[model samples]
Target: KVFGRCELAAAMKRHGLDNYRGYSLGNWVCAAKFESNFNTQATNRNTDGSTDYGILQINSRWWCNDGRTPGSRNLCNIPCSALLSSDITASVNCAKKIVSDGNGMNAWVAWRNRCKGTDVQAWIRGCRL
Candidate 1:
């Protein structure tokens, strides 16, 4: 399988989900596509006038409210550039943690199936360990 960019490949490598290469690339791309079209610097403005930014669409204002160092919020607040500079692996790991912490690999697996353009139920049935 192919990811659209090197940064994404690096991101996947950092996630340790790359063991299953096809699924890894597909799932990450799917998440990015669904989240922010893989835009590492994308941001969103909420109806409440709040802001969400960066590749993984982290909510800086809500998540990084605490006084901490730059890297302290790689998972939620750090800019993609800063996160990449500080540690790309950690940034990706943080993203993985966010997704997995929220819904485990089941979410990723579901995303992969969705992005695959096949029957989601069939994919799940086929892909189960």
Candidate 2:
């Protein structure tokens, strides 16, 4: 677990996510909170029979390859397990690409459902950004 939300924000900033690729840190933090509660090993099965992996809950259908899932696009060219590591560099990099592909944060249901059109500044409250 993170020491606090501030630490997670700091790490994300260090990885160039502080407004990197036109996405806000607040939205990222908010999405992470709902998607996985900052747990790197988090995973959830989607209603479509695809699984979401890691803190950002990247789907196996398009981003990473989970062995059991067939026909994954594997756009990140990394295994789903890579996203489950405490080191978020790989995940962040893939997220950047995902955002650049024009999905923005809409690729994440958590972001669309909760973080969107919401005052998400609390996600980074007390952070020294």
Candidate 3:
């Protein structure tokens, strides 16, 4: 199936963000940068060598798929399943929800006001995008 502006726009509207534009893209980019340096397929293996997966850096085994089963799917791309379900809006909403909890975004803002570093948390705290 062909995906074009009309289709993309419809998708955006379905996510309640009809005015999808550069700024919105910037937000996703920023979040990705903070979360996983924009790696849409990034996976992290901890110091003990356990694995985690995805661009949002979701720990697949814990949240989406049980780590042991072979050919298990990551939830981010799966349709209609929590954070993994649906499309980009789902991802954004999920992040926003986390950031908004307990004065979270405000906490980031406050951090941004004081620090400048490569720390994703700090950058996210003060990010204007």
Candidate 4:
């Protein structure tokens, strides 16, 4: 599920990610832009011996249960497969948890590198139907 900008905006709003944690919808949009390009099936294996999963790329070492990372905390308490679906339910929930965990959105280095402290609203403004 590779979503277009406005499509992603609607999806995020539907999942209550809009204004989540005082971070506007666009922040999530911007994060997704550089994180996975709105790809629901996005994933990455890291040198940390863990994998990042889904659109927001929640990590296995601290977020999901991949059954591979022996030391994983599984704070999100969801199987890695949960984040892979086109349905953004679990992905949205875990992202909220990540923010609530106090790491903030900076938990994604991509956000820091590309989205932080900028006018990210443009990410959600296209095709303003």
lDDT of 4 at 115: 93
Model 2 error, position 93 (Å): 0.7
Model 1, position 96, has a per-residue lDDT of: 54
lDDT of 4 by residue, 59-127 (tens): 999999999988889998899989999898899999999998877898999998999999988777764
Better of 1 and 4 by TM-score: 4
Which parts of model 3 are misplaced by more than 4 Å?
1-28, 48-52, 59-65, 68-87, 103-129
TM-score for candidate 2, please give it. Answer: 0.92
The sequence of per-residue lDDT tens digits that candidate 2 reaches over residues 28-58 is 9988889889998898998777898888888
The weakest ten consecutive residues by lDDT in model 4 span 120-129
lDDT of each: 0.47, 0.85, 0.39, 0.89
User: At residue 43, what lDDT does model 2 achieve?
Assistant: 89
Model 3, CA-based lDDT: 0.39
Worst 10 residues of 1 by lDDT: 120-129
TM-scores of the models, in the order given: 0.50, 0.92, 0.36, 0.95
The C-alpha local distance difference test score for the whole of candidate 4 amounts to 0.89
- Ranking of predictions according to lDDT: 4, 2, 1, 3
RMSD of each: 7.7, 1.4, 9.5, 1.3
